[PDB]
């Protein structure tokens, strides 16, 4: 029951500086080397580097000489990345791992930290519903910055037969839609509502659908 | 000095043995690799280590249909039996300590897609701008199109019946269960949905078109 978590996505402007976490669970931080791992949009994985977790010494590899910070805070169980002065091609998710060194592999990966680097602003999704055996009923997750956002159908009660597509991107905003399809005998006398959250700008919207 | 080097993409047929290549450089030709498997918006996952004369050891989450073979400077990762959940970024990757100094370096990863499956053709679900956003003087028309086989599609769109093209924004396909979906956006101002009779969502697939529309009226 090994867990690295990570922090969550962030949009950050070129020239400004972030700091990325990964807090490890289920083991002693301190006797395994913990790696990072940059991954661009539609790129292949990259590694930057690890920290000794036990004496805090970073290595880093040569593309990542000179912005680029590994620390560690052992007592919360956390290894931090930070990144200064900012560049646009910082865009990308980020990965801890740790290394066991039978065997040499990454055993164990946090689940990602997407970081935008764009001099746009940060929007909250405008959510509308969609309405039209089965009937299918969406919200539209419209104009929002940076990416991701999730979707859930009341609550997460609602799982199957739930679709939420890729996000579209124009103009620095991302749209995307999800849809749940239900029985044609509980709509409307039934209610579904959407809900959506929006982590790098802490918002969340619910959505009744109603008939148009 | 360690180079690792994949090819971006491979295509097999479904039940066949499949076989991935990752070449290490001349000068560490007798190396052990690792290959991981990648998934949309998941981490990777550990696949196997692989040694110079083919002995391996596979990970957690992996079935025995792979294995691992070696010839010179040649890792090869095998799936027997091709399966369509087979389809992922294979990435491989390898170690060194230098000085003192550890080191990893990643290939490129190759993108395994698994043909030869039944073909699906895709099902269009569309929906007319919301009240809410005509308020706001705007119209998204949204395309929803799911339950197709094999990932490619074109989509276009039209506005009575004559091409449009601004405006349209169109999704990658994604995987669901064994097949796809994706989505196609038009947006419009709230006066050109208005006064049109009718928007249509054209869909290709396999070189042939699927059409469904939306009527203002």
């Known amino acids: 029951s090994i867990q690295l978590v990570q922090s969550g996505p962030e949009l950050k402007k070129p020239g400004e500086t972030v700091r990325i976490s990964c807090k490890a669970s289920?083991?002693?931080?301190?006797?395994?080397?913990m790696n990072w791992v940059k991954q661009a949009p539609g790129k292949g994985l990259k590694w930057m580097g690890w920290?000794?977790?036990?004496?805090?010494?970073?290595t880093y590899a040569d593309d990542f000489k000179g912005r680029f910070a590994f620390s560690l805070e052992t007592s919360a169980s956390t290894a931090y990345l930070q990144i200064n002065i900012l560049k646009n091609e910082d865009t990308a998710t980020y990965f801890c791992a740790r290394r066991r060194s039978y065997s040499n592999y990454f055993d164990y990966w946090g689940q990602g930290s997407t970081l935008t680097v764009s001099s746009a602003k940060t929007t909250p999704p405008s959510v509308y519903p969609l309405a039209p055996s089965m009937v299918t009923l969406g919200c539209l997750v419209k104009g929002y910055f940076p990416e991701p956002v999730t979707v859930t159908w009341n609550s997460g009660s609602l799982s199957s037969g739930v679709h939420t597509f890729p996000a579209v991107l124009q103009s620095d905003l991302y749209t995307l839609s999800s849809s749940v399809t239900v029985p044609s005998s509980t709509w409307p006398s039934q209610t579904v509502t959407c809900n959506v959250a929006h982590p790098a700008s802490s918002t969340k919207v619910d959505k009744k659908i109603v008939p148009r | 000095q360690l180079v690792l080097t994949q090819s971006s993409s491979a295509s097999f047929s479904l039940g066949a043995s499949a076989k991935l290549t990752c070449t290490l450089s001349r000068q560490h030709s007798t190396y052990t690799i690792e290959w991981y498997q990648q998934q949309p918006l998941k981490p990777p996952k550990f696949v196997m280590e692989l040694k110079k004369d083919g002995s391996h050891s596979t990970g957690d989450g992996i079935p025995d249909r792979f294995s691992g073979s070696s010839s010179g400077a040649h890792r090869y990762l095998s799936i027997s039996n091709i399966q369509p959940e087979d389809e992922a970024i294979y990435i491989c990757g390898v170690g060194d300590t230098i000085k003192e100094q550890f080191v990893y370096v990643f290939g490129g990863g190759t993108k395994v897609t698994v043909l030869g499956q039944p073909k699906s053709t895709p099902t269009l679900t569309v929906f007319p701008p919301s009240s809410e956003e005509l308020k706001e003087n705007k119209a998204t028309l949204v395309c929803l199109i799911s339950n197709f086989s094999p990932s490619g599609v074109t989509v276009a769109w039209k506005a009575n019946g004559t091409p449009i093209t601004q405006g349209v924004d169109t999704s990658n396909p994604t995987k669901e269960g064994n097949k796809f979906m994706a989505s196609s956006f038009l947006h419009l101002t709230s006066d050109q949905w208005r006064s049109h009779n009718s928007f249509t969502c054209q869909v290709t697939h396999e070189g042939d078109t699927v059409e469904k529309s939306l009527s203002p009226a």
């Open positions: 289920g083991y002693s931080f301190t006797t395994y080397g």
């Open positions: 920290i000794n977790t036990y004496s805090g010494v970073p």
